Amino acid sequence: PSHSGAAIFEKVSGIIAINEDVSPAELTWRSTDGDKVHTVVLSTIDKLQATPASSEKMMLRLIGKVDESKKRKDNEGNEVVPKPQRHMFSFNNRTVMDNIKMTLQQIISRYKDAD
């Protein structure tokens, strides 16, 4: 029961679990009932963004890193061909939803500066 919070993905009520055992770590999400489960590494994330506390609909959003190796954004105009990754999760509490974002900020901030 270390590092976890009620996270609803794809309109599915489930609990999320962060694993900081490895460098890139791992964020597991299992349905509350028990049937659907998804796993996505947090290291892949690049930026963190969520809805304001005032917003009646409490939800978080995670943006992945862009591919600045093959993709090209022209020289003066930006001609990006692909698009960055962006996944959001529905929560039912500002405290829990805040515990996830606050943690994700440290996971990436520690792996983004360390390199």
Binding site: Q49, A50, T51, K57, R61, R86, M88
Partner: peptide, 13 residues
């Protein structure tokens, strides 16, 4: 039509 709006709710604050 609430798909595009979904990006705004997360984009801005």
């Amino acid at each position: 039509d609430l798909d595009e709006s979904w990006d705004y709710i997360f984009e801005t604050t």
